[PDB]
Amino acid sequence: VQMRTTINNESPLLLSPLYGNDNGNGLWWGNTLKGAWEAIPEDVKPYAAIELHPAKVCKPTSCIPRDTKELREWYVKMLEEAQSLNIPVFLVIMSAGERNTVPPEWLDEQFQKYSVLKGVLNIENYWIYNNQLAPHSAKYLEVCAKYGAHFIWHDHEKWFWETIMNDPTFFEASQKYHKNLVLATKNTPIRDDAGTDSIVSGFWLSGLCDNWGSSTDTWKWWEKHYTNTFETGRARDMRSYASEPESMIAMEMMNVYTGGGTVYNFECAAYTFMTNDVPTPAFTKGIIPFFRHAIQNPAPSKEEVVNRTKAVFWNGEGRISSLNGFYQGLYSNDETMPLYNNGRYHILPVIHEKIDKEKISSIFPNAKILTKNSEELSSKVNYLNSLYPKLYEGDGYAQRVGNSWYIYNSNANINKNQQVMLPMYTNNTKSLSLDLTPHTYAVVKENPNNLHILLNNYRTDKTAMWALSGNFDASKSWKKEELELANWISKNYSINPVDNDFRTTTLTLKGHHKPQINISGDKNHYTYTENWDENTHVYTITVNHNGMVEMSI
Ligand SMILES: C[C@@H]1O[C@@H](O[C@@H]2[C@@H](O)[C@@H](O)[C@@H](CO)O[C@H]2O)[C@@H](O)[C@H](O)[C@@H]1O
Predict the structure, then answer these.
(1) Structural domain boundaries of the chain?
(2) How many CB atoms lie within 10 A of CB 80?
(3) Which of 16, 62, 124, 225 to mutate to test the pocket of ligand 1 (most atoms within 8 A of CB)?
(4) CA 63 to ligand 1: nearest atom
(5) Atom 22 in ligand 1: which residue has the minimum CA distance?
(6) Is residue 95 within 6 Å of ligand 1 at its C-beta?
(7) Does 477 sit in the ligand 1 pocket, CB within 6 Å?
(8) Starting from the edge strand earliest in sequence, which strands make up the sheet with 368-370, in order?
């Protein structure tokens, strides 16, 4: 059967969600199916689809898709709409521990009828686990395999993913139907961010799913009790899900991309996508620019990831869920948040206990297999450092990915700059340094005879939103106050974003004739000064920006 969606490093997938309403036109946040697909740029459309989450249509609990007459009616109403407009769609059919979800035969029927139905999602179960979730998912995966569709499972936490793949039914189904399976993170619960990336990407490396990815959830900002950027001492509310810096959304995507991931999903959509059919700056100037990077520059392939891996951690003699300080001293000081401090080790893969040690040896013949009982873990950092050489100086995040450097400031909500000094692997320049403010990322690609540099620090001032009067408590999710915030967003944030405060990124090329650069960027959102020292052959460009800047040197 032909695959309904091609998903790989050369053809990544961007998911944008719509949510059901139990009234009106049947959709929340004032959006429509037509407006959703209208929001997706024409160059991105070949690599995109719309997620349909029944949300408020679900009864007795919103977002929990218990099979009902009304639920089916809603799926069918939306499928009819999407089919008429040739909009590729995925249905959320499992969530939050629900055991009585739509029958596999019902889904089979819908695949038969609707060419636009590309697959289904299972989302979020770590707080409400039961032993039916894995076998149910396995059955739906088999249905997906029948029709060339994809089953996408977003979930989180080390113990949880360990538990899922220990299920004999789901482990078997994964071995059979890996082509049709996507396993993905969902960093909502502000725990296990590093371990989850290692285990989920490890499933992909182990051949249990052909693609992995993420649901990047700005509700994490609410979970942390964070408010306006860098602010302390204010009570959280729904405005917190609209306050994670736009460029930081893209940095979360970069963690997936550079780990070989290929599927990107997002919450909360009132911030990350659209309200009243007006796409938001988080979407247009955060998610879209990074997704375009991923379309234009294929993520590391499975074999590239395998080949760069010097060690793996195998859960076979004790599990990563039992080593809560594992990533300390290596690359994450704080698993409650997604940003990595260090790119020296990439994402270290964690291999699941159901994969035999002989198979690991076969997949990664050149990697050390660490286990919990490895004597080398008595000096964990020194040992890993003997395998992964130090590649840069400074306190910023930098990762070497083939012929490129991937860089960001790792400070999530502390207003402090970071610096990196990056040795270079061609004689275009000897070394390249960056001074980065928070919520700035960069990508430097070394071509044979030029450097391509991408800078993006886009972050709107959230102050105006935080200054509004009213009750925006999260207990009014799915209620009129949430619409009120969404209505404000479509008339203020999305049309008159407060993005005129520029921040400075300083780029220095040491040991680089005075370059004649080609520079562009977001209209009216950057200025720059250049400096050339002909004796030292040092070129400095000082870029003041709020948004994207691109150069070829
Ligand atoms: C079960 C999930 O429900 C919704 O997500 C919830 C959010 O709306 C918010 O309350 C966060 C705070 O942690 O919790 C989530 O459960 C859906 O958006 C999601 O896709 C799941 O179906």
Answers:
(1) 1-300+460-498, 301-390, 391-459+499-553
(2) 13
(3) 124
(4) 22
(5) 63
(6) yes
(7) yes
(8) 350-351, 311-314, 368-370
